[PDB]
């Protein structure tokens, strides 16, 4: 009958076919990540191919039912999703070529190794070795070399590929009725239909810029403080008013200043909110770690892990014989099958990691009652935010205490707290500007606002403007630095990294209020609090189902992305920096350069 009703019958066939076929792709992909064989790595492609095809087939098959002739919101969403011409809306060659582009970039990146300018028998890869330098080296030159080698080898090689990349991908974007590839991505946060909850592809740019403003003071101050500390480690190389030399920021790009802790620690004479030693002493095994986390969730009103979770998961490294990939992952195979794959070691870190990944699983179950196409965090950054809330409560000394891993009568200390806070800023706050500038430049190279010859002239105008970072060596168009970063040269929207950050703070905030929290926002643990849970599980059981703006409302009572909870989390620190920066200079000169002479 009606094209709507006959479209329902379509989805109702898809969900049934997807469930089955998706599970086969998962099971195979699983056998592989836990038993790296040839027979296993073989199936990992087959079922994974039936999948890609099946979707392509179901996509064009759905490209019939006219989105325009529907009034049921859900069925409209689901169809919209299934209707992705994406790669198949181009010429015969223009598509296959884009793939050659995408594919080689991924491989020149993962493969590219740089050789010693004097010892050509040893050559380092980005991981490890190269990233090992950027992370530990206190030698101005050794760091200077690695940073430049990489952006010089793979840097250049990617310039031509990317050149064409931005064209074909843009051609595709405008071909689907999007202002540019940048508009294609911002699309993810788009919502049409339910009013008072809509959100336009441009609204993101506005909301991200408007919010980034309120981060500046905090950042400028973290910046100023880190600078002065760096000046000490690298005497005479840094300017008391200049930007910071990109190669001295802790990792290859300066995405995170995490590794800078060593030389920026406020009170080096403090010590170890590291219970690794304690866990090891009380004979804790993987089991305990995971059972302990399960308890944490049950403590807030969430379900015990499924029988088949303890039954089918792999919480320990198989060791010899059976080889397996170890990146901690939370699997949702579907069919009610949930698993965690993790080569657990008895560290406070793996302990926190396990609370994080068991958060993803807990989200996966919450929305598993949704129809296949709706099982997934609201927007790209919801799932990460949730997993991060957990590690946030589990990290508190309060929690480590009540769990018997921290001495029963150990005290706070307003100094050991300023430390922890900084360790966090170095990572959480340092990334934001970087992440936000990266995507800005990327967005503009999509709205066409940057000429092929001002690609690095405009890159670094901004690293100096926004992030407050200067290049150690000047870079012309022989390079293409905003591409030596995995996410860039492997085609991934970077902005998620920014929103999820904000989100994850708006979440933790509500959930502490909700669970009636006393002290500063950062010392909060939400355990034993079924009350908070309820509120979390409110936006959890939705999945992609309601607009992401609604979903946020469910936990934070607001239709939008607010950054004040992120600053509240950093208030005891934020003010403390304003004191250190008493006689330091705060801000920078885009003009100063390391190389200049």
């Amino acid at each position: 009958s009606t094209i709507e009703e006959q479209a329902k019958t379509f989805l109702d066939k898809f969900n049934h076919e997807a469930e089955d076929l998706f599970y086969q792709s998962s099971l195979a992909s699983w056998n592989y990540n836990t038993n790296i064989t040839e027979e296993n790595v073989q199936n990992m492609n087959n079922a994974g191919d039936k999948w890609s095809a099946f979707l392509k087939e179901q996509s064009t098959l759905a490209q019939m039912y006219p989105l325009q002739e529907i009034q049921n919101l859900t069925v409209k969403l689901q169809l919209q999703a299934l209707q992705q011409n994406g790669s198949s809306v181009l010429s015969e060659d223009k598509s296959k070529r884009l793939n050659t582009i995408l594919n080689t970039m991924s491989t020149i990146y993962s493969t590219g190794k740089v050789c010693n300018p004097d010892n050509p028998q040893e050559c380092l890869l980005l991981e490890p070795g190269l990233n090992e330098i950027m992370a530990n080296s206190l030698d101005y030159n050794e760091r200077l070399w690695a940073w430049e080698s990489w952006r010089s080898e793979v840097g250049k090689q990617l310039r031509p590929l990317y050149e064409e990349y931005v064209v074909l991908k843009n051609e595709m974007a405008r071909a689907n009725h999007y202002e540019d590839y940048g508009d294609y991505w911002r699309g993810d946060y788009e919502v049409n239909g339910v009013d008072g909850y809509d959100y336009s592809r441009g609204q993101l740019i506005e909301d991200v810029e408007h919010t980034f403003e309120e981060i500046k003071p905090l950042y400028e101050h973290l910046h100023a403080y880190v600078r002065a500390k760096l000046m000490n480690a690298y005497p005479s190389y840094i300017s008391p008013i200049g930007c910071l030399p990109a190669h001295l920021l802790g990792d290859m790009w300066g995405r995170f200043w995490t590794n800078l802790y060593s030389l920026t620690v406020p009170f080096g004479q403090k010590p170890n909110i590291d219970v690794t030693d304690a866990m090891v002493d009380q004979a804790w095994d993987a089991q305990r770690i995971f059972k302990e986390a399960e308890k944490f969730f049950v403590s807030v009103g969430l379900p015990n892990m499924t029988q088949g979770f303890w039954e089918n998961s792999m919480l320990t490294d198989p060791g010899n014989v059976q080889k397996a990939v170890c990146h901690p992952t939370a699997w949702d195979l579907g069919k009610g099958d949930f698993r965690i794959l993790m080569c657990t070691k008895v560290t406070m870190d793996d302990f926190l990691t396990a609370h994080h990944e068991m958060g993803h699983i807990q989200y996966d179950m919450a929305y598993a009652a949704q129809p296949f196409l709706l099982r997934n965090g609201a927007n790209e950054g919801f799932h990460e935010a949730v997993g991060e809330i957990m590690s946030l409560s589990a990290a508190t000394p309060k929690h480590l205490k009540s769990i018997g891993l921290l001495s029963p009568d150990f005290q706070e200390d307003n100094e050991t707290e300023i430390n922890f806070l900084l360790k966090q800023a170095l990572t959480i706050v340092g990334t934001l500007p970087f992440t936000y500038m990266l995507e800005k430049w990327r967005w503009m190279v999509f709205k066409g606002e940057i000429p092929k010859d001002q690609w690095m002239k405009k890159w670094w105008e901004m690293k100096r403007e926004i992030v407050g970072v200067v290049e150690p060596v000047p870079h012309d168009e022989t390079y293409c630095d905003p591409a030596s970063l995995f996410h860039v040269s492997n085609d991934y929207s970077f902005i998620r990294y920014y929103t999820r950050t904000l989100y994850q703070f708006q979440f933790q905030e509500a959930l502490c209020q909700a669970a009636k929290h006393e002290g500063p926002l950062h010392k909060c643990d939400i355990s034993n609090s079924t009350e908070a849970g309820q509120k979390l599980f409110n936006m959890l059981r939705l999945g992609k189902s309601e607009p992401w703006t609604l979903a946020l409302e469910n936990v934070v009572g607001a239709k939008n992305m607010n950054v004040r909870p992120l600053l509240n989390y950093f208030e005891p620190l934020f003010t403390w920096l304003k004191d250190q920066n008493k006689n330091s200079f705060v801000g920078w000169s885009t003009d100063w350069s390391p190389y200049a002479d």
């Binding site: 009958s1 006959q6 109702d12 066939k13 049934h16 599970y23 099971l27 499924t306 009610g336």
Partner: protein, 174 residues
């Protein structure tokens, strides 16, 4: 009395093509099933006693689908495969058969019907594997808007309980 043949039997049918065993004459005690935590449902809709005095239907369904073999009840299984009258009744027993009906490779023999014009009248059956179209029109799959109404479950040993194989036996009383 001839209950052994029923639930102790080897092969069970799919839901859409269920079995109705006719048991009259002989006498059974009911202590056979009374005493046993083997079953995971054992709900009854009328009584729960004895008197040494009868229809037994059997089929297999997904875990989460067991809640539908009961009076009233939502749809899909209850709408297109097996329906209990809101009225009449006896008991409904089920047990997890993940060992038997599920293989680690995937078992798709057991099937169900997800598309049909209308709902089943209680105790009605439909073994009509005829290409479905949401308008009565005949079907020539792969023509668009044509789907086969009969699908296989796909019982893997590793699914969640909601997706594991359960054998059902509805005991009707007459």
């Amino acid at each position: 009395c001839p209950f052994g043949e029923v639930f102790n039997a080897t092969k069970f049918p799919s839901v859409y093509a269920w079995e109705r065993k006719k048991i009259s004459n002989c006498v059974a005690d009911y202590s056979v099933l009374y005493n046993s935590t083997f079953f995971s449902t054992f709900k009854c809709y009328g009584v729960s006693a004895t008197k040494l005095n009868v229809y037994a239907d059997s089929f297999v369904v997904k875990g989460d689908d067991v809640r539908q073999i009961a009076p009233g009840q939502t749809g899909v299984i209850a709408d297109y495969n097996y329906k209990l009258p809101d009225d009449f009744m006896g008991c409904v027993l089920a047990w997890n058969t993940r060992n038997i009906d599920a293989t680690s490779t995937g078992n798709y023999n057991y099937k169900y019907r997800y598309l049909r014009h209308g709902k089943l009248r209680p105790f009605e059956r439909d073994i009509s594997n005829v290409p479905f179209s949401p308008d009565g029109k005949p079907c020539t799959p792969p023509a668009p808007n044509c789907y086969w109404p009969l699908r296989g479950y796909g019982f893997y040993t590793t699914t969640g309980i909601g997706y594991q194989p359960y054998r059902v036996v509805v005991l009707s009383f007459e």
